[PDB]
Amino acid sequence: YSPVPSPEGTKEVYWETKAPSSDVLGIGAGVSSGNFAASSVVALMIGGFCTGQVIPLTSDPNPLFLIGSFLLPYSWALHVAAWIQKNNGK
Amino acid sequence: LYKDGVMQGKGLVAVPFALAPDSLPADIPGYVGFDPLGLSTLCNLDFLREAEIKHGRVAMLAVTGSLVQDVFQFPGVDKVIGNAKMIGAHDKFIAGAHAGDTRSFAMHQIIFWVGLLEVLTMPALFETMNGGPRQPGDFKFDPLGLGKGDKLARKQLTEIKNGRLAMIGVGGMVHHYLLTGKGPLQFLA
Amino acid sequence: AMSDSVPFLKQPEALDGSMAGDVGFDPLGFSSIGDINFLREAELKHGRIAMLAAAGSIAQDIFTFPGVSKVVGTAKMTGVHDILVKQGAMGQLLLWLSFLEVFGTIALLETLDGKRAPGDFKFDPLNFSKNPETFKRYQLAEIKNGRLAMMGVGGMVHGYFITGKGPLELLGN
Numbered sequence: 001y002s003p004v005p006s007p008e009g010t011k012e013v014y015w016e017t018k019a020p021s022s023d024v025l026g027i028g029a030g031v032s033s034g035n036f037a038a039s040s041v042v043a044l045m046i047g048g049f050c051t052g053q054v055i056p057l058t059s060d061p062n063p064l065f066l067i068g069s070f071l072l073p074y075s076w077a078l079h080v081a082a083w084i085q086k087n088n089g090k
Numbered sequence: 091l092y093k094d095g096v097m098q099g100k101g102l103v104a105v106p107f108a109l110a111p112d113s114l115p116a117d118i119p120g121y122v123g124f125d126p127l128g129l130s131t132l133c134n135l136d137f138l139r140e141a142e143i144k145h146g147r148v149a150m151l152a153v154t155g156s157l158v159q160d161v162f163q164f165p166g167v168d169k170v171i172g173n174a175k176m177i178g179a180h181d182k183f184i185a186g187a188h189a190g191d192t193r194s195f196a197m198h199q200i201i202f203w204v205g206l207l208e209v210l211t212m213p214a215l216f217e218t219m220n221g222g223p224r225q226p227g228d229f230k231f232d233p234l235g236l237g238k239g240d241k242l243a244r245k246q247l248t249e250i251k252n253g254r255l256a257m258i259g260v261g262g263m264v265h266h267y268l269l270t271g272k273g274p275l276q277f278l279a
Numbered sequence: 280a281m282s283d284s285v286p287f288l289k290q291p292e293a294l295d296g297s298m299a300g301d302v303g304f305d306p307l308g309f310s311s312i313g314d315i316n317f318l319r320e321a322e323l324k325h326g327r328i329a330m331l332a333a334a335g336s337i338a339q340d341i342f343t344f345p346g347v348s349k350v351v352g353t354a355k356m357t358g359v360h361d362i363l364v365k366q367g368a369m370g371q372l373l374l375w376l377s378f379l380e381v382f383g384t385i386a387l388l389e390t391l392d393g394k395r396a397p398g399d400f401k402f403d404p405l406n407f408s409k410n411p412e413t414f415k416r417y418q419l420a421e422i423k424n425g426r427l428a429m430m431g432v433g434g435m436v437h438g439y440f441i442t443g444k445g446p447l448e449l450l451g452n
């Protein structure tokens with residue numbers, strides 16, 4: 001009815017090809033697939049190590065390992081972005 | 091290549107009953123014909139060549155350190171390590187780093203700096219595996235400018251060969267340690 | 280087109296060479312993620328704060344202000360921070376720097392629209408940028424000394440962590 005507003009810079013990212021366009025990665029649209037895959041492997045290793053350091057959780061956990069544990073769910077989005085950039089010719 | 095068709099390259103067959111894959115090309119420095127198990131079909135060729143070169147260069151530094159540490163020890167290493175060498179030394183360094191000794195942190199420093207160099211040189215691998223202008227092993231590292239012309243070609247051959255030779259040597263120098271102890275020159279004599 | 284600093288690597292796309300100290304050094308590709316103006320404003324802020332921190336570490340080895348020696352005792356470098364958090368110096372400085380950084384937030388918002396150069400606060404009271412070549416030379420010197428002071432502050436503080444002495448107390452023996 002009335003025009004539905006969107007934030008400035010909103011583009012059409014609907015895709016039916018093998019992979020989405022790189023624009024779905026937002027600020028990471030210019031990162032190569034190799035960099036994404038390497039960062040995903042490194043993020044998995046660091047997140048798993050930090051998590052395994054904090055699995056017997058105490059009342060005084062190390063803040064650094066707590067911060068580093070969040071890289072383990074980050075690595076999933078990283079390998080998805082790696083697949084996207086690899087199938088986008090990047 | 092250096093003596094192409096004689097020392098390396100076209101025509102040469104290393105194992106006559108197990109031919110190398112036809113996917114394995116003939117313009118890589120060090121191609122003699124030797125891939126009897128067809129292992130070049132299971133990985134990217136750029137990754138394989140650069141892995142061979144890196145394994146070889148690390149082995150070259152390892153043999154020239156394995157002999158020299160038998161010959162020459164730096165001042166004050168005796169206070170930290172003592173009479174140990176090769177596979178022991180690494181361990182006890184970490185053991186000293188596990189003990190609390192704030193002066194035995196050599197392997198942690200080298201793992202830090204070598205890991206930083208590897209992390210920063212990963213995009214060279216990524217651009218080489220995408221058919222970029224960089225060939226495997228080429229970091230453009232020639233400070234003295236000695237291989238600046240055709241002299242490079244010969245050197246490339248010798249590099250890979252010495253790398254392969256070094257790759258064997260360390261293994262002997264390690265497993266010969268693990269049975270007896272001692273070291274390369276203590277085991278020769 | 281390969282990068283000049285790292286010759287075996289492709290030149291970064293977001294690095295033109297127009298900025299002071301641009302040698303094309305970005306192996307990890309950080310300039311592709313962030314806006315380059317935001318990154319340069321961050322680099323200049325880190326470098327200027329580190330320049331002041333390096334000069335401060337050297338000066339607080341050299342001499343102390345009147346009365347500070349009773350408040351802090353013999354607890355030089357980062358050891359005073361906690362002590363002066365119990366006192367009111369750190370809170371006062373945090374308040375005034377937070378004021379200045381609110382206005383710096385407005386300046387960064389104007390930088391991100393392409394209407395302000397990164398790190399440009401137009402603060403030249405004693406006129407030194409009187410010539411457009413001295414301006415480029417001073418820009419290169421500012422960015423180089425900022426990076427050098429970043430690593431120097433890192434060295435001074437971590438050496439203080441190991442020894443407890445200070446930047447110039449360490450060189451004293």
Ligand code: CLA
Nearest residue numbers: 148151152154155158159162163164167175179180196231
């Ligand atoms: C695979 C490589 C390697 C490894 C893992 C080690 C490991 C070790 N060495 Mg050893 N060493 C090496 C190579 C190596 N070395 C080489 C090549 C030499 C010279 C021929 C030496 C000479 C040497 C001495 C004299 C001593 C050790 C010692 C030690 C031990 C303590 C760490 C230390 O201070 O090292 C010190 C190592 C060095 C000073 C050598 C580094 C020289 C580098 C490799 C030059 C690289 C130049 C090249 C252009 C850089 C390219 C980088 C990039 C572009 C690829 C440790 C077990 C000490 C020890 O405990 O004795 C038992 C000791 O006293 N080493």
Ligand code: CLA
Nearest residue numbers: 328331332334335338339342343344347351359360368402
């Ligand atoms: C990152 C910067 C930084 C930080 C966090 C600190 C923090 C601290 N300093 Mg220190 N200091 C600094 C830089 C810094 N200083 C510089 C640059 C110098 C001079 C070379 C000094 C000289 C100094 C002395 C002599 C003493 C301290 C002391 C202290 C402590 C108590 C606060 C105080 O009285 O400061 C006093 C500091 C000053 C009055 C220096 C102010 C100089 C500023 C930076 C000039 C900026 C002008 C600039 C052009 C304006 C731009 C505005 C805008 C455009 C950005 C505190 C931990 C005291 C202490 O506890 O010692 C153990 C003390 O006695 N400082």
Ligand code: CLA
Nearest residue numbers: 327330334337338399400401402403407417418420421424
């Ligand atoms: C290496 C030092 C250095 C240099 C060369 C520059 C250079 C520049 N700055 Mg800059 N700046 C610096 C440090 C520096 N800055 C620091 C630390 C801060 C934080 C306070 C700032 C904050 C700042 C702002 C906010 C602005 C600039 C601007 C400028 C540009 C205008 C020209 C000008 O005034 O510079 C000439 C500068 C010099 C000749 C440097 C003087 C060096 C002094 C005299 C020595 C300091 C001695 C120290 C205090 C005593 C140490 C004590 C000891 C015991 C340790 C120019 C590119 C402006 C700009 O880009 O737009 C026009 C601008 O808006 N700068």
Ligand SMILES: CC1=C(C#C/C(C)=C/C=C/C(C)=C/C=C/C=C(C)/C=C/C=C(\C)C#CC2=C(C)C[C@@H](O)CC2(C)C)C(C)(C)C[C@H](O)C1
Nearest residue numbers: 305306307308325328329332335336356357359429430432
């Ligand atoms: C660009 C390039 C990268 C590169 C990189 C490099 C590695 C970037 C890393 C940089 C580091 C060095 C940044 C340093 C900031 C220093 C300041 C902020 C600390 C100031 C001290 C504070 C204010 C203080 C204190 C003060 C108070 C509290 C107490 C006082 O008693 C003492 C004192 C006065 C000192 C890499 C290699 C990753 C690759 C990538 O592809 C691109």
Ligand SMILES: CC1=C(C#C/C(C)=C/C=C/C(C)=C/C=C/C=C(C)/C=C/C=C(\C)C#CC2=C(C)C[C@@H](O)CC2(C)C)C(C)(C)C[C@H](O)C1
Nearest residue numbers: 330331333334402403404405424427428431434435446449
């Ligand atoms: C622009 C503005 C101007 C203003 C201005 C400001 C005041 C300009 C001043 C900028 C000053 C603060 C420059 C500070 C540089 C610090 C250097 C790079 C570092 C040394 C660290 C390294 C070497 C080290 C360390 C080392 C290791 C780690 C540990 C130690 O054991 C030893 C050691 C110490 C050797 C003014 C007002 C004049 C007018 C102008 O119109 C506008």
Ligand SMILES: CC1=C(C#C/C(C)=C/C=C\C(C)=C\C=C/C=C(C)/C=C/C=C(\C)C#CC2=C(C)C[C@@H](O)CC2(C)C)C(C)(C)C[C@H](O)C1
Nearest residue numbers: 124152176177178180181257258259260261262264265268
């Ligand atoms: C004969 C022949 C041929 C051939 C050939 C072949 C097949 C060659 C075979 C070579 C072999 C079998 C090498 C084996 C291992 C060598 C290694 C791992 C090297 C270094 C190990 C290290 C440093 C270690 C370590 C360690 C460290 C540091 C840390 C410690 O905490 C643990 C540990 C002890 C593990 C050809 C091709 C010419 C054909 C011909 O017709 C017949």
Ligand SMILES: CC1=C(C#C/C(C)=C/C=C/C(C)=C/C=C/C=C(C)/C=C/C=C(C)/C=C/C2=C(C)CCCC2(C)C)C(C)(C)C[C@H](O)C1
Nearest residue numbers: 206329332356357358360361429430431432433434436437
């Ligand atoms: C105030 C306060 C505190 C504090 C604090 C402070 C002031 C902390 C400051 C920390 C800073 C400024 C750290 C900087 C670290 C820099 C590093 C590791 C650089 C590495 C460079 C590398 C590896 C390589 C460089 C390089 C080399 C050689 C080869 C490659 C190229 C290049 C990049 C040039 C606490 C936390 C203690 C608490 C206290 O209660 C209050």
